[PDB]
Symmetry: D2
Subunit: 232 residues, 4 copies
Amino acid sequence: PLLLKDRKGRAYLVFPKEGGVFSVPHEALLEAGPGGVVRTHLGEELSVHRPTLEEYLLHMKTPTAPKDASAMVTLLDLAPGMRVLEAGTGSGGLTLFLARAVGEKGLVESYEARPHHLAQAERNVRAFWQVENVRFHLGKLEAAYDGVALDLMEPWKVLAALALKPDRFLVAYLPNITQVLELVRAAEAHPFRLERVLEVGWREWEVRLPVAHPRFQQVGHTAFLVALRRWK
Amino acid sequence: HEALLEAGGVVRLSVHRPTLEEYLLHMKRSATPTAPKDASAMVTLLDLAPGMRVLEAGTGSGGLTLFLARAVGEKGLVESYEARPHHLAQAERNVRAFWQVENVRFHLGKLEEAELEEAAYDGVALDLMEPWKVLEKAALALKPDRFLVAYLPNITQVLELVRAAEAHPFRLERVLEVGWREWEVRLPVAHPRFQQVGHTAFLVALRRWKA
Amino acid sequence: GPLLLKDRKGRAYLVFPKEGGVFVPHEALLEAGPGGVVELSVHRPTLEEYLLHMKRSATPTAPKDASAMVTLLDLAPGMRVLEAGTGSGGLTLFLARAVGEKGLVESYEARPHHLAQAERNVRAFWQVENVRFHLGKLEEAELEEAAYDGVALDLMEPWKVLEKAALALKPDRFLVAYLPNITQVLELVRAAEAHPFRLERVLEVGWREWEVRLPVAHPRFQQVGHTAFLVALRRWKA
Amino acid sequence: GPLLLKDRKGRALVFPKEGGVFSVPHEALLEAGPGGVVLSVHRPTLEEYLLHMKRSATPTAPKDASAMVTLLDLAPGMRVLEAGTGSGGLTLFLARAVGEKGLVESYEARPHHLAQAERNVRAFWQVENVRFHLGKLEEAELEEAAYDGVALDLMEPWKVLEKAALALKPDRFLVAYLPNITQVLELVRAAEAHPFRLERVLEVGWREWEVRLPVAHPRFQQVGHTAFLVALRRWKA
Ligand SMILES: C[S@@+](CC[C@H](N)C(=O)[O-])C[C@H]1O[C@@H](n2cnc3c(N)ncnc32)[C@H](O)[C@@H]1O
Ligand SMILES: C[S@@+](CC[C@H](N)C(=O)[O-])C[C@H]1O[C@@H](n2cnc3c(N)ncnc32)[C@H](O)[C@@H]1O
Ligand SMILES: C[S@@+](CC[C@H](N)C(=O)[O-])C[C@H]1O[C@@H](n2cnc3c(N)ncnc32)[C@H](O)[C@@H]1O
Ligand SMILES: C[S@@+](CC[C@H](N)C(=O)[O-])C[C@H]1O[C@@H](n2cnc3c(N)ncnc32)[C@H](O)[C@@H]1O
């Protein structure tokens, strides 16, 4: 697909089809294509782009944020050829990050309790990730898995007890420090050792020389990440 | 060492098959490795997907290579250069132990004088003292709408590289600091760590155009 | 004195009370009074709340930074501190408190339009007459040598006032400057080499807020990302 | 009064007594003076002093102590309540804000803590507007609605809301210095049962840069965390 951006930075995500109109023809968008510019009939100018998993997530049709999604893959030590349990799935986003990490051969197993959620998710993964390497289940989520990941309100519930090897993790993405602690206590019943709790930070700078300052506006918080390590 | 191997798991202590971050942090040294908080982010900044062809310089201890090599896949490839001989080795030695998959081609010598192909590279991951030098050599390799990401400690180098990128076909996309605010949680004691690593380096993202 | 009103959304309104004043009526607020309620709650505004809502011409210095600047200047009561520019008089109020009635704030502003609002704002909040306002550039003003305990700066080109600051400032005292761009920091720092100044501090102040409406408890989603760097230099002896 | 040096290595509090040395005698230090040379000599800042002074108990960090004043919204002439005195660090920040005509009424339960606390405040700050009391705050007899602020720094702060609310005027805050987040919620949870409308929960960060051109970067070694600041404004009864 393609990402169309203006002067302000507002971005438009387009899936071009022949005879397609965004009043701009997709043929003209493709003429330039990624790295090129197109001028509209109102003369606007919109730079044409091939989107990253970062930009797509943000403009695709409530996703897990890129900064955090990014970190989790590193938290789960996801390497190529692994199987990971996800729920999710909601709108996707974090799936793509995982599916990307497990490489064609590797599998990512995703569950989704609601229904209309998984519909949208697959649609998004469909139209960006042509590979079929994620296993989708429409439902509320032995020692065979290499990771577990959740973007639920209640990771403490579905605590996946045996569906995880030694040296594997469960990373939960919780926006309130209460939720963490409400989840952290539950590990006094299971074989786990809290290794980490952290809040990801991506501090954007504004550099338009000689202007150079951290951005006046930023998104201070999204959520915390908690890391657990199985025993045996 | 046996009880460890039969543990999985405690021992008379705890024990693990190391994760990429732990390895990196505890693996051996030649030059100071790129820290994990940024490497995690950098892979996303380069938009690395499985089957991609990424450029890299330098290797130092081989820390960045691993994050890249894991990311591009067995099919995908990481072409990576290094001009300090002892340094390339440890990266050669450190990567092989944790990454036995041979999807990483190694090179001795400056990236500046590399013999590379035009518009064959999906990304250029940079970590060295004077990034502005490889700008022409990186611009040739890189494709339209792809990125070069550089790992810069001082803000002065950021502005130096950003200034020099005027002569080359890039658009400055990002300058960012990566922050992982840690905690010490032996609950009900919960507080962010009193001791934190305040800063390693800024990340500079440059997007290629066509031409 | 002025009043501050807040609603269920946390949005705040700054009021000059009067008889017959119309907001809800005014003397109805008075009779309730600070901490009271009319659902709208009424307050004696803090120096922070004031700055963030006091009528502004030029942009006032942020409360988190102004707070830190007073500490970096090490201002105790009775000290004589220099200022430029007055802007809308925000940093001035912080400075005036710190040096007290026995002390003084010698402040310069180069724009007559800005200065009035700066003065109009100080006096509606600060009744103590320990501030001497001055019109014009600090670079052209006449000062006694080594007769100032501190120089507080908030302007775009602090490097042009370095010679007169180095003069006015006592031995071993501080000059702190409020600068948004890191490039302005480096310029000022390269220029400081040419005066009797030892560069002490370059820092970013951050007041990172939370929302606690238990059971919700987290750092605020939308935060004030950045204002400016604080650069502190100490005057030598000689 | 006191003096602080920095060496070529640039680190560290000389207390001049007649006929003594640091190797260069005190009288030599006074003559070279503030910004003078002998190691250099300076008249310490309140920030420098708090950090390098003797501490029986750990002081409030100057960035937090600085921010505590602004949240407490203290102007000259005010009467402010403090506990615990500890080593007397935050005590000095408070006293400067209220001025000669103001008052800092400060309590401290542990005697050895109050002792060196008094010695620390007095050596540095000789204006007489600090009131010391050995003992607890929840057991102190105070005038009702006669205090413009309450600065807290103890381990179980939720225990003085009742007594703090007594002293405080309408619309005046109670700002507390608390290391753990667990600590914070309990207070917010205890404050439910008291005439208090929670206004603020905030972290302070003074992020130092190292600038030695061409070198220019935020410091590798920072202070990760000290404590949260909790501001609680009182109801008009
Ligand atoms: C929104 S996604 C979380 C973010 C996701 N990782 C992403 O792509 O950014 C999770 C979605 O799955 C659904 N869901 C998750 N757990 C659920 C549960 N336990 N019961 C019902 N629905 C659930 C919710 O609709 C929610 O919107
Ligand atoms: C600081 S190390 C980075 C280590 C690596 N990123 C890691 O994670 O382990 C960077 C290395 O790049 C090398 N280098 C510097 N300039 C280079 C150049 N022009 N071409 C290739 N390597 C270079 C240096 O010798 C240095 O050892
Ligand atoms: C950002 S505003 C000051 C904000 C200040 N922190 C406050 O609370 O109002 C900058 C002001 O400094 C003044 N100024 C700029 N350059 C000056 C100079 N060289 N001498 C005196 N005043 C100056 C201008 O009038 C301008 O309104
Ligand atoms: C960590 S110190 C406080 C530090 C202080 N804010 C400073 O800047 O130096 C704790 C001290 O507070 C005192 N304290 C603790 N609880 C108290 C209470 N409930 N009432 C009065 N003092 C108390 C104890 O004497 C202890 O030595």
